[model samples]
Target: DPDQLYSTLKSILQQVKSHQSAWPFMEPVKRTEAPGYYEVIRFPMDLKTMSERLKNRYYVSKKLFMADLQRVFTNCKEYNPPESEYYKCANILEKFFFSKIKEAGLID
Candidate 1:
């Protein structure tokens, strides 16, 4: 199951990276870059981390994989102003991710 999931997830991450508004989410946001980032955001998530997790076989279940991906959107929205570009980007990327997972049948 992991093998099959990994293959599909790997493809999903590539598409996520290619999404036009995905620019800010490709890497982890450093605390230094956003003064109180670590203190405020309960957990950090990013496409790079997701990609590494996939490569390292870190996700063994669909929920784990999807939750991590969802956290990218959650963290962005939670940390940024509602009207911010980061917030908007998170919205679009989350929508794109959801659709892709549905198509992959990774979600029902």
Candidate 2:
């Protein structure tokens, strides 16, 4: 399964390389960094999903978690449109983490 996903992503990059011949400006894209890309992002937060399959340290890392939240702040401020779902999600995440860090004794 890991090999399958890796190969699929590799294939997409390979295609980009070939297509770059036809459009020289067609640089490889980080799907996440594209404008409006985060709007399509969704996390499955249903009860069973979180309480069972998703509740684990392997699924999350503390350092990267904070870094990603910081990135969300940057993304919202810089790239996302004001009306986009991603912008809204980032806003909510910022608020949640702000209160959480204070609650966890990370902030005063």
Candidate 3:
């Protein structure tokens, strides 16, 4: 069940990667001019790393994952720009993870 949800997210990411024109969220955004937010905006983890982190060993409990997800959401919410399509992308990704976590019984 969890695996299926992960796979679905993976598929969605792939769709985003391939259909950039179709999804405005796949568009790139320039780095902001600031001390902490000067870095280029991008996904928190790559596909391989995300997959590994979701596994039994690295991701032992749901609470840890929930915390990480919350951090991701916070970071994205802060870094997102009004003109950047990545803003939409970040929100979509975060909500997807949130939904999956709840569906997996990690959160109520």
Candidate 4:
């Protein structure tokens, strides 16, 4: 029973990972040429360390994995999100948009 339940959960997680777009907080970055915006910046999950958190399997650890997600979930409604969801959304636009930037800065 435990194994079955775990299998079910793993399946659900896989679906969420594949279907749920990374940086749902982010909007699409403008397409451009000359490596303009991307060459200069990156964002959270940009580095190996940050990315590894997501790979770890534990819902409770979401607090550890993406404290930002927690912060957003906790504060987005009442606290103005510290940064507008729109701006973060724009930078990320999708997933992996800010990896380089986030890595370079070593901050979210």
Candidate 5:
């Protein structure tokens, strides 16, 4: 289930990379500085599961997410993620999600 979302989202990203506008300064631009960059990072809030089941949605705590994240890093030996790519993806994901945690009022 989770892998499905991951692969689908990854494929969507691949397609989004195909179109390139012909602009002079567009030759070299960082993602953070790019126009319409908010679309890349913005995620909608999901509240349905929070009101439905005990084990769903809002019940998942910040501490548990942090622990699971730590486990992902600590369990790296058996399931190796390349240091180069992990540095890119993991760092960004960590920062992005932690920022979401704060935005959701789950963390201080």
Candidate 6:
């Protein structure tokens, strides 16, 4: 059921948002927070957005839920080089997402 799916999604999302490396992704990166952020990354995704979507039924499928999270990491990696903390955080969170999703059996 979609309600059960939302429960699973919400649990995973809370974990992702509470991660130590999740600071950068907790909210939308504003232009003021990081100069030229909007200029470089055309699509920006964050935990806040994901949380809203999860509650609002934006992620109707399990795959779409994962896809948006990947987009969040991809956007960070694209906007910042590997040397940057943002990039590092993205890497950490990506790994975290995979592991959590696996344990939850959200994907095969």
TM-score of each: 0.92, 0.38, 0.46, 0.28, 0.34, 0.94
Off by over 4 Å in 1: none
Write model 3 residue lDDT over 1-108, tens digit each, in one string: 566555644554454335433243322222453344535443543333434565534544456545554554455566766556656655676666555545545431
Candidate 6 lDDT (Cα, whole model)?
0.88
Better of 2 and 3 by TM-score: 3
Whole-model Cα lDDT of every candidate shown, in order: 0.88, 0.40, 0.49, 0.36, 0.35, 0.88
lDDT of 4 by residue, 1-108 (tens): 434433443443343334334344323234362134444333322222332433454433323434533333332233234476633543343234234324333221
Off by over 4 Å in 4: 24-72, 75-108
Over 4 Å off in model 6, which ranges?
none
| Backbone clashes (count) for model 4 | 12
Best TM-score goes to which candidate?
A: 6
| C-alpha lDDT of candidate 4 relative to the true structure | 0.36
Candidate 2: TM-score?
0.38
**Residue 77 error, candidate 2, Å:** 3.1
**Model 6 misses residue 63 by how many Å?**
1.4
